[PDB]
Amino acid sequence: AFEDRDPTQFEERHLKFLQQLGKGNFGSVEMCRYDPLQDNTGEVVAVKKLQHSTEEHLRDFEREIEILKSLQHDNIVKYKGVCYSAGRRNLKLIMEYLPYGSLRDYLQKHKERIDHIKLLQYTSQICKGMEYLGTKRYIHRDLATRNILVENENRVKIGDFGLTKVLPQDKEYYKVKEPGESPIFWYAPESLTESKFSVASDVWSFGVVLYELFTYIEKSKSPPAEFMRMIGNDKQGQMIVFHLIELLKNNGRLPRPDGCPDEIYMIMTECWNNNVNQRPSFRDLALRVDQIRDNMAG
Numbered sequence: 001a002f003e004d005r006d007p008t009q010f011e012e013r014h015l016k017f018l019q020q021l022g023k024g025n026f027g028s029v030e031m032c033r034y035d036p037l038q039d040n041t042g043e044v045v046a047v048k049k050l051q052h053s054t055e056e057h058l059r060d061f062e063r064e065i066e067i068l069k070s071l072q073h074d075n076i077v078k079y080k081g082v083c084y085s086a087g088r089r090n091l092k093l094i095m096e097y098l099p100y101g102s103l104r105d106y107l108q109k110h111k112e113r114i115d116h117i118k119l120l121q122y123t124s125q126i127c128k129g130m131e132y133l134g135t136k137r138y139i140h141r142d143l144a145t146r147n148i149l150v151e152n153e154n155r156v157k158i159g160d161f162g163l164t165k166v167l168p169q170d171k172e173y174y175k176v177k178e179p180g181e182s183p184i185f186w187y188a189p190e191s192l193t194e195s196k197f198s199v200a201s202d203v204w205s206f207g208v209v210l211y212e213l214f215t216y217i218e219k220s221k222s223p224p225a226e227f228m229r230m231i232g233n234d235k236q237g238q239m240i241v242f243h244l245i246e247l248l249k250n251n252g253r254l255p256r257p258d259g260c261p262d263e264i265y266m267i268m269t270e271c272w273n274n275n276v277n278q279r280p281s282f283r284d285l286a287l288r289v290d291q292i293r294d295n296m297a298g
């Protein structure tokens with residue numbers, strides 16, 4: 001006898017591994033098939049599992065799952081459910097499978113299908129996803145083309161909410177002192193110096209995403225390569241951070257990509273403002289981008 005009142009619970013025995021897809025924040029995403037009829041008419045899903053798990057990490061994973069579940073938007077990756085694997089003594093996150101993978105990889109592998117109009121289309125979509133995120137007071141903390149997904153030519157979706165934080169109701173920034181490796185070449189100055197994350201710091205990072213888009217992931221032009229080149233490729237360890245901070249605090253910036261219109265570089269530049277409160281909002285950004293796109297079409 002059987003009654004299914006929870007389609008967000010995926011049965012372990014019907015979830016079959018197909019392929020590995022890629023690493024994400026403290027974990028790993030794999031391509032799986034969910035086939036509860038064993039007739040091979042089921043759907044392909046993306047499944048995230050933790051790597052090197054612990055009690056703390058599992059609790060974080062649980063918060064990420066609830067964050068993802070709370071989100072419903074065309075430009076945010078779809079939550080599908082959970083799988084309580086290991087005879088219900090483990091946790092896995094079930095997500096939609098997006099065939100073209102990360103935007104970073106897609107930009108590199110399909111340059112022939114990409115032009116400025118498309119880049120702006122994606123820029124717009126990312127902004128709108130981020131508008132949506134702000135309505136829930138979620139601070140993403142890891143905006144980057146590696147964490148943006150491509151559904152098709154005409155649509156991208158924000159992913160990896162593994163670092164995402166919810167603003168504590170009475171505050172406008174979240175201070176997160178954390179051990180291990182941070183993606184420093186996407187961090188706002190106050191995130192580097194004070195560990196302070198906010199909607200504004202996501203706007204900073206979006207500026208770096210916009211840069212990424214107009215470099216087409218050329219290699220040698222990536223934020224890390226550029227910053228390291230500016231800082232000195234010799235530098236190791238903490239010295240890297242010291243010089244990046246100093247560099248940013250005194251107006252050192254990623255250069256304008258070759259072929260990038262002045263107007264688009266201006267947007268990057270405004271996002272990269274040391275004055276947190278002078279940065280534009282995601283709503284300002286989507287409107288400006290869409291107005292550029294609308295004014296270009298002729």
Ligand SMILES: CC1(n2cnc3cnc4[nH]ccc4c32)CCN(S(C)(=O)=O)CC1
Nearest residue numbers: 021022023024029046097098101159160
């Ligand atoms: C590479 C990626 N991926 C490649 N093909 C995919 C297909 N579907 C996916 N769903 C979620 C991620 C994902 C895919 C899996 C890992 N990430 S993440 C956001 O976890 O850092 C980027 C996307």
